[PDB]
Structures are given as structure tokens and as C-alpha cells.
Design an enzyme around this catalytic site. Structure first.
Site, PDB file in Angstrom:
ATOM      1  N   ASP A   1      56.052  23.742  12.664  1.00  0.00           N
ATOM      2  CA  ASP A   1      57.334  23.902  13.394  1.00  0.00           C
ATOM      3  C   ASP A   1      58.492  24.074  12.419  1.00  0.00           C
ATOM      4  O   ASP A   1      59.321  23.198  12.270  1.00  0.00           O
ATOM      5  CB  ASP A   1      57.578  22.660  14.245  1.00  0.00           C
ATOM      6  CG  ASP A   1      58.555  22.995  15.373  1.00  0.00           C
ATOM      7  OD1 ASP A   1      58.609  24.151  15.759  1.00  0.00           O
ATOM      8  OD2 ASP A   1      59.230  22.089  15.831  1.00  0.00           O
ATOM      9  N   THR A   2      58.584  25.200  11.776  1.00  0.00           N
ATOM     10  CA  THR A   2      59.719  25.412  10.848  1.00  0.00           C
ATOM     11  C   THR A   2      61.016  25.325  11.649  1.00  0.00           C
ATOM     12  O   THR A   2      62.092  25.189  11.102  1.00  0.00           O
ATOM     13  CB  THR A   2      59.600  26.786  10.200  1.00  0.00           C
ATOM     14  OG1 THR A   2      58.252  27.012   9.809  1.00  0.00           O
ATOM     15  CG2 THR A   2      60.505  26.849   8.974  1.00  0.00           C
ATOM     16  N   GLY A   3      60.917  25.398  12.953  1.00  0.00           N
ATOM     17  CA  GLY A   3      62.137  25.315  13.801  1.00  0.00           C
ATOM     18  C   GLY A   3      62.667  23.876  13.802  1.00  0.00           C
ATOM     19  O   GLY A   3      63.855  23.642  13.716  1.00  0.00           O
TER      20      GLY A   3
HETATM   21  O1  LIG Z   1      60.969  21.543  22.178  1.00  0.00           O
HETATM   22  C1  LIG Z   1      60.704  22.133  21.140  1.00  0.00           C
HETATM   23  N1  LIG Z   1      59.764  23.086  21.186  1.00  0.00           N
HETATM   24  C2  LIG Z   1      59.467  23.578  22.528  1.00  0.00           C
HETATM   25  C3  LIG Z   1      59.254  25.031  22.660  1.00  0.00           C
HETATM   26  C4  LIG Z   1      58.452  25.536  23.670  1.00  0.00           C
HETATM   27  C5  LIG Z   1      58.263  26.904  23.785  1.00  0.00           C
HETATM   28  C6  LIG Z   1      58.876  27.765  22.889  1.00  0.00           C
HETATM   29  C7  LIG Z   1      58.676  29.247  23.009  1.00  0.00           C
HETATM   30  O2  LIG Z   1      57.351  29.589  22.627  1.00  0.00           O
HETATM   31  C8  LIG Z   1      59.676  27.260  21.880  1.00  0.00           C
HETATM   32  C9  LIG Z   1      59.865  25.895  21.765  1.00  0.00           C
HETATM   33  C10 LIG Z   1      58.878  23.494  20.069  1.00  0.00           C
HETATM   34  C11 LIG Z   1      57.923  22.333  19.804  1.00  0.00           C
HETATM   35  C12 LIG Z   1      56.831  22.261  20.838  1.00  0.00           C
HETATM   36  C13 LIG Z   1      56.123  23.394  21.200  1.00  0.00           C
HETATM   37  C14 LIG Z   1      55.132  23.307  22.163  1.00  0.00           C
HETATM   38  C15 LIG Z   1      54.857  22.088  22.763  1.00  0.00           C
HETATM   39  C16 LIG Z   1      55.566  20.962  22.401  1.00  0.00           C
HETATM   40  C17 LIG Z   1      56.549  21.049  21.439  1.00  0.00           C
HETATM   41  C18 LIG Z   1      59.580  24.118  18.864  1.00  0.00           C
HETATM   42  O3  LIG Z   1      58.587  24.619  18.043  1.00  0.00           O
HETATM   43  C19 LIG Z   1      60.481  23.178  18.100  1.00  0.00           C
HETATM   44  O4  LIG Z   1      60.980  23.792  16.966  1.00  0.00           O
HETATM   45  C20 LIG Z   1      61.688  22.668  18.889  1.00  0.00           C
HETATM   46  C21 LIG Z   1      62.696  23.703  19.381  1.00  0.00           C
HETATM   47  C22 LIG Z   1      64.081  23.122  19.499  1.00  0.00           C
HETATM   48  C23 LIG Z   1      64.615  22.354  18.478  1.00  0.00           C
HETATM   49  C24 LIG Z   1      65.884  21.818  18.614  1.00  0.00           C
HETATM   50  C25 LIG Z   1      66.611  22.049  19.771  1.00  0.00           C
HETATM   51  C26 LIG Z   1      66.074  22.814  20.786  1.00  0.00           C
HETATM   52  C27 LIG Z   1      64.812  23.350  20.650  1.00  0.00           C
HETATM   53  N2  LIG Z   1      61.378  21.784  20.036  1.00  0.00           N
HETATM   54  C28 LIG Z   1      62.041  20.485  20.114  1.00  0.00           C
HETATM   55  C29 LIG Z   1      61.994  19.649  18.900  1.00  0.00           C
HETATM   56  C30 LIG Z   1      62.987  18.717  18.651  1.00  0.00           C
HETATM   57  C31 LIG Z   1      62.935  17.938  17.507  1.00  0.00           C
HETATM   58  C32 LIG Z   1      61.889  18.093  16.612  1.00  0.00           C
HETATM   59  C33 LIG Z   1      61.826  17.253  15.371  1.00  0.00           C
HETATM   60  O5  LIG Z   1      63.004  17.437  14.601  1.00  0.00           O
HETATM   61  C34 LIG Z   1      60.898  19.023  16.861  1.00  0.00           C
HETATM   62  C35 LIG Z   1      60.950  19.801  18.003  1.00  0.00           C
END
Ligand SMILES: O=C1N(Cc2ccc(CO)cc2)[C@H](Cc2ccccc2)[C@H](O)[C@@H](O)[C@@H](Cc2ccccc2)N1Cc1ccc(CO)cc1
Lengths: 99, 99
Positions: free
Chosen positions: A25-27
Site C-alpha cells: 500500500d504505497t498509498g
Molecule cells: O481504505 C483504504 N484503502 C481502500 C481502497 C479500496 C479500493 C480502492 C480502489 O481499488 C482503493 C482504496 C486501501 C487499503 C485497502 C484496500 C482493500 C481492502 C482494505 C484496505 C488503499 O490501498 C490505502 O492506501 C488507503 C487509501 C486512503 C488513504 C488515506 C485516505 C483515504 C484513502 N486506505 C485507507 C488507509 C488508511 C490508513 C492506512 C495506514 O496509514 C492505510 C490505508
């Protein structure tokens, strides 16, 4: 390690003497991780991303092995349906998004 | 373009003559994006990730320019607090997670 395979770059992580698939999750900015087997000595917190805010445990200093490579970092243990690896860990394994 | 800066690899994307910060999220499988003005032609859907399931609009074929580089892809427009660039777009710009 290069990981493209035009698909989800998952890496077998090794945290708390355990092994699970981690969605690179580079995001995310940290390495979240569905509930697992981790010892106390952590801090309670909650992340707010897509859908709502989940509760996790900021485990600072967790030897997570990604790609057969040792990598300690902050693993947030919560009710997440996936082992998320954010920058907190992409900085230890030296991950780089080149496009 | 290589992007490490041991931090969030954000990129100014240009979708539908629009521009917002995109959190390079190799974790997601598609490119989600807070509500915005897309080029119509899309379908209603809902993603289920961290916290709960949000509602987005699968906008297939959206010229999203990342790094001054044109890149069409599926931009899900929903109530997301960020512009997520998943693999659907990391495959057009040829992104690679190397660590
Ligand atoms: O909900 C998150 N999705 C959900 C998601 C679903 C579908 C798509 C489109 O395909 C994109 C993102 C991913 C992690 C995940 C994926 C699948 C199942 C469960 C989780 C994502 O990959 C992550 O980057 C961040 C995106 C994000 C970050 C900040 C603000 C808004 C959105 N998140 C939430 C997240 C929050 C904090 C951390 C730790 O710091 C990690 C993740």
C-alpha cells in the site's frame, strides 16, 4: 526487488512470528495489518480512510519480513481486511514507485 | 518518474480538465478519486476497504495525466477524501514498486 506484474504487488510479510499476504500500500503512510499475533507494548489509535475509520494498534518496531528481507516498522493491528504496507515500511525495504 | 522521498508519492493528476493531488496508492487495484467532474460515461458502484464501503463511479477511459504524462484509466469518483491511483493507473504509467 522489482514488483510490477501489472497487478497487486503483495509481499509475504513476517510480523509477530507470523506470515500473511501484504498489499503493497504505497498509498498508506504506515503499515496497517488485520488483527494478528502481536505482544503488548503498543498504542491504541484509529485510521480514517475509505469507508470510515478503523481501530488499530500502532506497533512501533515490528520486524516485518517483506520479500525475504528484514524490515522493522510501525504495524497498525486492527480490524482491517488486508495487511497494508504503507511508506513507514516502503522506506525500510527501499520501495520506489518508478513509472 | 521515480518517486521515493521516503514519504507519500503524491502526483498532480489532470482528470477531465481537473487537477487534484493523487496519493500513489499501489495498494488499491483501481484509481479512486474524491467526487469531481468526469467526462460522463460511467457506472455506479461501491468499494469496500478500510472503515466501510464508499460509493464511487467507475469512470472507464479517463485521461488522467500523472507526472505531466497522459494516462487514461478507470477513475472511481466517490466520497473519497483522496485521489487514489491504484494499479489500474500504475499499469498505464508503467509504475514499478522496487525495494
Ligand atoms: O481504505 C483504504 N484503502 C481502500 C481502497 C479500496 C479500493 C480502492 C480502489 O481499488 C482503493 C482504496 C486501501 C487499503 C485497502 C484496500 C482493500 C481492502 C482494505 C484496505 C488503499 O490501498 C490505502 O492506501 C488507503 C487509501 C486512503 C488513504 C488515506 C485516505 C483515504 C484513502 N486506505 C485507507 C488507509 C488508511 C490508513 C492506512 C495506514 O496509514 C492505510 C490505508
Amino acid at each position: 526487488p522489482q514488483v510490477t506484474l501489472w497487478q497487486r504487488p503483495l509481499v509475504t510479510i513476517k510480523i509477530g512470528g507470523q506470515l500473511k499476504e501484504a498489499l503493497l500500500d504505497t498509498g498508506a503512510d504506515d503499515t496497517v495489518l488485520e488483527e494478528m499475533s502481536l505482544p503488548g507494548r503498543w498504542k491504541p489509535k484509529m485510521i480514517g480512510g475509505i469507508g470510515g475509520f478503523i481501530k488499530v494498534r500502532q506497533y512501533d518496531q515490528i520486524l516485518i519480513e517483506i520479500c525475504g528481507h528484514k524490515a522493522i516498522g510501525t504495524v497498525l493491528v486492527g480490524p482491517t481486511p488486508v495487511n497494508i504496507i504503507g511508506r513507514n515500511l516502503l522506506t525500510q525495504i527501499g520501495a520506489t514507485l518508478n513509472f
